[PDB]
Amino acid sequence: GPDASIHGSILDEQTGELVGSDMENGNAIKVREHGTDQTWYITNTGEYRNNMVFAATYDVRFENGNFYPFEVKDFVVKSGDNVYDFKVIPYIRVKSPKVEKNGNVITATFSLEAGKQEVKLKEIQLFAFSDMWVGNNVKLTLNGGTDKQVFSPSTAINSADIYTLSIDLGQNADVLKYSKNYYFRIGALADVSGVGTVRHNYAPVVVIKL
Ligand SMILES: [Cl-]
Numbered sequence: 001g002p003d004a005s006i007h008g009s010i011l012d013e014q015t016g017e018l019v020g021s022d023m024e025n026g027n028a029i030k031v032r033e034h035g036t037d038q039t040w041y042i043t044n045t046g047e048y049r050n051n052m053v054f055a056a057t058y059d060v061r062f063e064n065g066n067f068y069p070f071e072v073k074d075f076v077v078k079s080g081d082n083v084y085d086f087k088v089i090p091y092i093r094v095k096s097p098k099v100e101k102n103g104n105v106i107t108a109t110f111s112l113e114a115g116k117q118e119v120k121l122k123e124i125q126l127f128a129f130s131d132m133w134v135g136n137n138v139k140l141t142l143n144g145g146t147d148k149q150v151f152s153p154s155t156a157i158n159s160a161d162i163y164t165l166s167i168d169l170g171q172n173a174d175v176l177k178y179s180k181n182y183y184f185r186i187g188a189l190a191d192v193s194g195v196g197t198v199r200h201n202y203a204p205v206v207v208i209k210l
């Protein structure tokens, strides 16, 4: 049986902050044992944990995520516990994120920073859910259209620009119920080439009691 365990974090190479995604249909650790390819899944915060791994040498691969792809060759998993943080370049960084309730409206304000100059902006969205696993993969269907904006053609990222997204609670009382706790998460979807399928970048989850 398995003789090892491994845990660690997906970290921004520049800021050292956790890089969040969606556990399902988001970032993933693809590994190949030396000598059939398995996947190690990552919680939404960017922290990962696996208590069922075999002590061996691997090739690690990152693809179709929300950060620039790369490989880690000759990755040794020792017998027992192992710790390893991966340093990445997200396509987009959400800056100064703020999510607050004013009256009967949830308002998100933020700025964006490109991971590389070539990165453009395709979408922005204020995701909402009844639990902390909120994201593009775990979300409520909302009315009004102000919770999401699509840029076609994809637009330039300028750090000085202030973006605003809104959710009207009265127009969404069916899924955002009065007196209950909800988790809101700012997401930004980049437009990038050679990197396969681009996934959303996120700001940390904000819990609000309605
Ligand atoms: Cl650059």
Ligand SMILES: [Cl-]
Residues within 6 Å of the ligand: 179, 180, 181
């Ligand atoms: Cl609740």
